[PDB]
Amino acid sequence: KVFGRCELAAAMKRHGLDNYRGYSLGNWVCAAKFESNFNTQATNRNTDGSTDYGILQINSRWWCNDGRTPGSRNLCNIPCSALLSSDITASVNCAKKIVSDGNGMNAWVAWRNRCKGTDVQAWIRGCRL
């Protein structure tokens, strides 16, 4: 599914991401924009052989099982395929675990490089929330 901006903002808020670990909704929307362009089916292969999956490009090195990442973990206890669903529940639940791991949203390199410190409220401006 490719979400609309405000559509995704509303979904993330309904799943409790808004201000989760202190990160306002626009941080999450911004991250999803640059990770996936709001496409739940986004995948991308890393240099190390892991793969990032879904709206928030969650990686198989730690977070999910794809059967093809040697030595990896599955700390969200999900198949990585769950992260590609039109239903964002699994991506959100797993993102809550990631952002709690100690480095906050810096776990998303793209967040650090493109969202951190910017006017992230722009990403939710206008939306009925």
Residues recognised as catalytic: 35, 52
Here the tokens at position 2 are: 């490719």
Q: How many Å apart are CA 122 and CA 119, to the nearest integer?
A: 6
Instruction: State the DSSP code for 69.
Output: S
Range in contact with Na ion (rule: CB under 5 A) among 68-76, 92-100, 104-112, 117-125: 68-76
SS3 of residue 52 by DSSP: strand
Is residue 18 annotated as involved in ligand binding? no
CA 125 to chain centre: 20
Residue from the set 39, 41, 43, 74 that interacts with Na ion by CB under 5 A: 74
CA-CA-CA-CA dihedral for 55, 114, 94, 8, to nearest 10? -40
Residue 45, H or E segment: strand 43-45
Task: Supply the minimum distance, in Å, between the C-beta of residue 53 and Na ion.
Answer: 10
Range in contact with Na ion (rule: CB under 5 A) among 12-20, 26-34, 53-61, 110-118: 53-61
User: Nearer Cβ to Na ion, position 27 or 60?
Assistant: 60
* Residues at the interface with Cl ion (CB under 5 A): 4-7, 11, 18-19, 24-26, 46-47, 65, 67, 69, 72-74, 79, 88, 90, 93, 104, 121
Annotated binding site for substrate: 101
